[PDB]
Each structure stands twice: as C-alpha cells, then as structure tokens.
Amino acid sequence: LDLEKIFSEDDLQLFHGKSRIQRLNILNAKFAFNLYRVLKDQVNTFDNIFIAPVGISTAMGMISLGLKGETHEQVHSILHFKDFVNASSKYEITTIHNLFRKLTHRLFRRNFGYTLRSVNDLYIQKQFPILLDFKTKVREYYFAEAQIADFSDPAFISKTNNHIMKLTKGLIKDALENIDPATQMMILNCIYFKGSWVNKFPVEMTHNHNFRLNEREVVKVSMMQTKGNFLAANDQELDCDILQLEYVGGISMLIVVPHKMSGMKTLEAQLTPRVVERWQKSMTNRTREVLLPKFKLEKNYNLVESLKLMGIRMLFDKNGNMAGISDQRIAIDLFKHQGTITVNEEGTQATTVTTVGFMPLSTQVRFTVDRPFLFLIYEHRTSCLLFMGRVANPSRS
Amino acid sequence: ILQLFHGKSRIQRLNILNAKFAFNLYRVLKDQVNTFDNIFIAPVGISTAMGMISLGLKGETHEQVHSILHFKDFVNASSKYEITTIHNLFRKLTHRLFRRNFGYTLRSVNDLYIQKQFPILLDFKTKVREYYFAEAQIADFSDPAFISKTNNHIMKLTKGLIKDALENIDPATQMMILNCIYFKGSWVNKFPVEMTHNHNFRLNEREVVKVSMMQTKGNFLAANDQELDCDILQLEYVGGISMLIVVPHKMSGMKTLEAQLTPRVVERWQKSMTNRTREVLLPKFKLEKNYNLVESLKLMGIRMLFDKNGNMAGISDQRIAIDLFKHQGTITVNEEGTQATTVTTVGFMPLSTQVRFTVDRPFLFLIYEHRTSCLLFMGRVANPSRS
Ligand SMILES: *[C@@H]1O[C@H](CO)[C@@H](O[C@@H]2O[C@H](CO)[C@@H](O[C@@H]3O[C@H](CO)[C@@H](O)[C@H](O)[C@@H]3O)[C@H](O)[C@H]2NC(C)=O)[C@H](O)[C@H]1NC(C)=O
Ligand SMILES: *[C@@H]1O[C@H](CO)[C@@H](O)[C@H](O)[C@H]1NC(C)=O
Ligand SMILES: [Ca+2]
C-alpha cells in the first residue's frame, strides 16, 4: 500500500411560509449582498473581506429612530426596510423596530452552544446634547446606548476600548484607536462570535496543501481535514459548490466555492437571497471527507463611503435631518465596522482542543476547498445572516 | 408534455421516446427478477427490432407495437411526422451507429429466424434489410448444423463474446427474434491498474461485501438530484459515448429511482451537470444476461404479435407468431474501458483533484451516444461480484 502515498498529491416566492422575523432577515440579507457588491469595489481583488451584516442592518435601524424626512427615507429604502413594511398592510415602521427588538434579544441573550455578542453604539461629542426620547428608544428596541463622548479625551478612548475588549473576550483591543479627535458623531459596529464545529477537524491532520490564488499561481496553506456528515450542493448556473459547516447550537457556515477563477466575480455579482434559498433547497446529506484551510480575518472598515455609493447621503451631511437625535446640526463622520473571525480545528474563536476520536470510518465523497471562496454564517431559526466574507488568500488576514 | 423536443434534432426526439419505452420495459423486467440480481439490456436493439418487425404487421397487431413502443407518441407529437418517419429515422440511426466509427466498435445483431417451411415474403425481406440492416433468415431449429452455424456466426460478430446465441431452443420453434448489441470502447479517463483494490460495497441496509474497486483521477461531469437523492457521474468513452452512473444515496432510494426514471429526469441531470477534476472509485463488473422479452412485452400490452390469430400478413402468407424474443448481451467494465483487450500503463492522471466520489453502493448505469442521444444500454449493478 505504498500506493496511497503515490496516489496522494502531497509533497413573493421566498416569503411563502416564512415567519415575520425570517422575512425581515430576507430583506436584511438582500441589503447585505448589495452592500458587499459595493464594498468589494473598494478593496483589492486579492484581499479578503469580512463583515457582520446583521450588525450593519441593526445599526441603521437604530440610527433611523432619530432621523426624519428624506434623510430617514434614503436609509429605509436602501436597507430595504421599505420593501418589508410594503409586503403587507399589517406592518409599519414601528414593526421593523419591534422585530429588530425581538431579534436582538433572541440573538444576543445567553444561548446554548455558542456566544453571540453585539456592539451597536452611537457616540456623540458632549457639546451636542442627545434628546432623551431617542436615548430611551435606542435602548428600548436595540438594547443599545447613545452615549455622550469626548474623542479628544484619552480617558474616553481608553474606556471604550477596554469595554469592547472585555465584551469581545479580548478579541478587539483597538476599537477607538487612530480616530480623528475632531469627530462629532460616530457609529461603532461589531459582532462577536464564538462557536464550535459540530464536525470538528482532528488536529494532527492539518497540513500544508496547495491553494490556488489565481489562474497562474498557487501557495501553501494550513489545510484542515476531517470526516463527517455535511449537507452540500452545486450550482450549475453559477458553477460553484456550496458546503454547509454546522456549529453547535443552530448556526452554520456556508462555504461557496466557484470552480473557475473568473467565477468569483459572477457569483459576487449574482448573490441574492433567492440564490441562497435555491442552494438550501437542493442540498443533500452525505458522509464527506472535508478539507478546509484555516484562516484568520481582521477587518476594520468605515462604511460611510459604501453607504454613500448605495444612495444614503443626507445622513452624512450636516444638512441632513436628525432632529430626532439632537436639536443641533450634526452628522455621522465615521461608521466604524470592525471584526475578527478565526477558523481552526475546534470552531470559531475557539479556545479548547478536542483530541478524542470521533470521525466515521469511511466517507462516500470528499471536497477540497483549494481555491477562493465566499462564506456565509446564518442562524437557522431566524434565517439571519450574521457574517459574510471572502477568502481570496487564507494566508493573509 | 414534449418541451424536451425543443432544440432536439429529429433523431434525438425519436431516441427520447425510445428511452421512454426503455424505462417502462425496465420497470416491467425488474419485477421478473430478484431485487438482488443485476440487470442488463440494450434498449436501442429492442426498439429497432420492434420497428423492423412492424414492417410486416397490420391492424391492431401493428397498433399494439407502435403504441407500447411509443412510436405513436412520436408521430402524434408533430404533424410533420408519420409512420414512415420512424423507419427513415431508424435507417439513418442504424447506419450512423453500426457503420465503422472512430474510437469504438458498435455492432448490431437484429435477426428474425423463420422455420424453412413457412416462406418469407421477399418484399418484407428487403424493406427489413433496407431500413434496419436486419436479416429475415430461413431457419431449421431441429438441424444442429443451423444452430451451430448461427452460434459461430454470432460468436465471430461479437468477437467471441456471445457463444450460445441459439443454444437450448425448442426445435418446434417457428419464428424468433435474436437481438444483441456488441460494444467495445475505451475510457477517456482510464484507471491506473495498480490502484485497483478490494473495497467494501454496500449490498443493502444489512450487508456489505468486498469487491474489486478501481481508482482514478480525471475530469468528469457529475450532477446531484435532490428529489431522488442520487448522484450522477458521467464516464466518457472515446468517440462521443458515455456511461452515466446513477447512485441513490439510500437503499430505499433504488426502488424510487427505478420507479421514477424517465427521459425528463435524465434531461434534468444533464442540464445540472458540472465539470470537476475528481478522484473516482468504481467497482469493476461483468454482466452476462439473456432474457426472453415475450412475457415483458405481453405485460406491457403487446399480445397479438405473440399469437397465431395475429396479423403477420406482411411477413408471411401462413399462420405464424413470434415464439420467442431473445435479447442477450454482455458488458465488462475494467480499467481500460468496456470489452477492452488492451492495457494502458503510461502515466496520465492529473496531479490533483478537488473532489472524490466512491461508488460503494447499488447503482444503475445508462450508456448514451451523444450525437443522437441514443440510449444504447442500461443496467443495474446490485452486486458487482455477481454476473
Ligand atoms: C445527515 O444524516 C445523518 C445520518 O447518516 C445524520 O446523523 C445522525 O443524526 C441522528 C440525529 O442526531 C442520530 O440518530 C439519533 O441519535 C440519538 C442519540 O445519538 C438517538 O436517541 C435517536 O434515536 C437517533 O438514533 C445519528 O446518530 C446520526 N448519525 C448517524 C447514525 O448517521 C445527520 O444528523 C444528518 N444531518 C443533517 C440532516 O443535517
Ligand atoms: C472539463 O475540463 C477539462 C479541462 O480542464 C476539459 O478537457 C473537459 O472537456 C471538461 N469537461 C467536459 C466538457 O467534458
Ligand atoms: Ca492534502
């Protein structure tokens, strides 16, 4: 059997039947992919991407509690909150907020199997007062806080960073670092996720395996390898494979791998809630040997320009209308969205190691993630898109 | 209904109805055998044999055949088509398939044997030849010289594959149809011979057996069927012919797939297929089947053709009915291809594969000729270690 060494290559349609929350999340997902479409054009084609959609949508829903007129409407049409209140006459703007309140309590309250935490705050220079009505509704429907701030006082910068560092179990340590002290109003958005794989990867099987970066160049990456039951699907139209990795607790990661290098662009341009639904319904259960590169993404963006490209402009102009937030003229200077995701043999943001034996003895198929791929992290019960990212190069952050 | 036809050529449309008959015949034939037995038939041969025979039938006798063979669905599918369209199409198909071809050998044995007592109308004899390359021959099932001559002739034709074509046949036989399709092809993606090894193969929910499993790498098209929960792998032969491997995920899946298989289903698989570089494990096997399709054809609805009170007026002047419809065939699948006699040892596998697919459980296989969409063969491998 020296052959195994030689053979080896080593060395509405959608809304039908969906709960009210799921519908909202279908719209939030639609926005997310549109946002991604815009974000991707602001980064190199060879860079990885990582964002937490539910965090962005929740930040916009919250901020809008204090917006009015066109300013408010640009935000609601583009976030697609409109499409929702329109889906039926039994809804309304307040419905969006109540639904978001339920989602937030449901997602960010102690849960079994994983840790989901949200940082959704608004910081406003102490010179501009914050209307109490806005302050309580934010805390009421989003459990968030509109805090008074002082971007020129290192005591404020320091306090916030430590808060976020604790909240994210030491993951995010520089939330408000390198921020212009002349800032008047900013949004800090960050979702923290810690979970473990239903099908873990035995640590001794991780090894160097070739990963294709583009049509003509490959690199070595730490490749994890495991066996187990996984749902998977193929998309003939977009020519890509979709593998579903389950975390304990009702949360999964969809690994979307386009067969061709020129396929990524098409997939990114085509990705919508319907496409995802299509993949979900054509999924099948199989015993699979799965090879996945481990990776760690550390991203930090300012979404103001992306939101501007999509059509939300008044909210970023002192001439916009935020009479619901302050009686004084202000506007968002920075919409900071930061987050990290570490994928290893145990799960995500894992701190434990599992050495016991647990793989099935044989597997009918195998799928090797050896080329650029997109990943989507969903919460099953609510069909909520928590995270989304592109891994163009697993050896880069 | 027939939205399948959209885009298809005229020969393809006929071969679609031909395939429809094939799956119905399969459905009927599988109930005449054991759930654990393997099955192997050559659909194209059966359809062409029935088309030929029909040139000599009339009335309800003729109607049953064109009906159960779905020849009726074909003409009834376009005002442009008529009964002679079937025959014109079969002559073109027969010539394209059984004439010298590149990459593979495809030979046909479509004969009708009639006791020498009953004469054969010369008219029917020529049309049979002119449209199906069929031979309405004179016979003597009591003279061993005849049996022997026929056996040696088929043995030569099938390159030594079929040796007992007319063995164990009732001498009192008056008229019969001998039907075989000989095929020899080589894989586009062969299997390295040293990689073949014993591998566990699922026979059913309860038992597993060891079989000779081949292992290779290469580019293959494959699809996934969520409704039937089956995987479909396409194995290309040199020359535009391919074997489709249909593996239901669950044991109980075989029954459903066999019950649901239709031209539309296959069409769906084809449209959903993608190309990948895969590691493919496939068990080698050898099917040797010999059936008398009379019973099956009767169960399907063709009865007059098999009774003296039938109308075979165009074949002969005297009263005669088909006594036996013999369909015999053999298929061997190895590292080189099918019915191969050569061995390839040169290196040829790609260096890496993105996916792997192990055929470790019961499966069905369909062999199609791409240009004409002709279903040459179809079978069931319930146990690769059985014939
Ligand atoms: C994909 O299909 C596999 C089946 O091959 C599913 O795995 C099986 O999941 C069930 C449910 O968790 C397990 O069976 C149950 O086990 C519990 C205790 O372990 C027992 O109390 C129940 O009566 C039942 O037997 C099973 O162990 C597990 N593995 C097996 C036997 O295959 C898997 O959940 C499916 N994944 C999907 C549909 O997402
Ligand atoms: C799969 O791709 C290979 C080249 O990568 C090509 O030779 C083959 O024809 C493709 N599959 C098809 C269409 O048979
Ligand atoms: Ca490897």
Curated annotation (Swiss-Prot), chain B:
Q: Which domain of life is it from?
A: Eukaryota
Q: How is it modified after translation?
A: Phosphorylated by FAM20C in the extracellular medium.
Disorder named in the UniProt entry? Thrombophilia due to heparin cofactor 2 deficiency: A hemostatic disorder characterized by a tendency to recurrent thrombosis.
| Tissue expression notes | Expressed predominantly in liver. Also present in plasma.
Domain remark in the UniProt entry:
The N-terminal acidic repeat region mediates, in part, the glycosaminoglycan-accelerated thrombin inhibition.
Which UniProt keyword terms apply here?
Blood coagulation, Chemotaxis, Disease variant, Glycoprotein, Hemostasis, Heparin-binding, Phosphoprotein, Protease inhibitor, Repeat, Serine protease inhibitor, Signal, Sulfation, Thrombophilia
Q: Which residues of the full protein are shown?
A: 113 to 499 of 499
Q: Where is this site: Reactive bond?
A: 351-352
- Protein family according to the UniProt entry: Belongs to the serpin family.
**Annotated consequence of substituting residue 350 to L:** In THPH10; Tokushima; impaired secretion of the mutant molecules
List the GO molecular function terms.
Answer: endopeptidase inhibitor activity; heparin binding; serine-type endopeptidase inhibitor activity
Q: Name a single GO cellular component.
A: extracellular exosome
The record describes the protein's role as: Thrombin inhibitor activated by the glycosaminoglycans, heparin or dermatan sulfate. In the presence of the latter, HC-II becomes the predominant thrombin inhibitor in place of antithrombin III (AT-III). Also inhibits chymotrypsin, but in a glycosaminoglycan-independent manner. Peptides at the N-terminal of HC-II have chemotactic activity for both monocytes and neutrophils.
Region: Glycosaminoglycan-binding site; residue ranges are 80-100
Record-level GO BP terms? blood coagulation; chemotaxis
Protein name (database record): Heparin cofactor 2
Q: What is the effect of changing residue 92 to N?
A: Reduced heparin- and no dermatan sulfate-activated inhibition
Glycan attachment positions: 76, 275
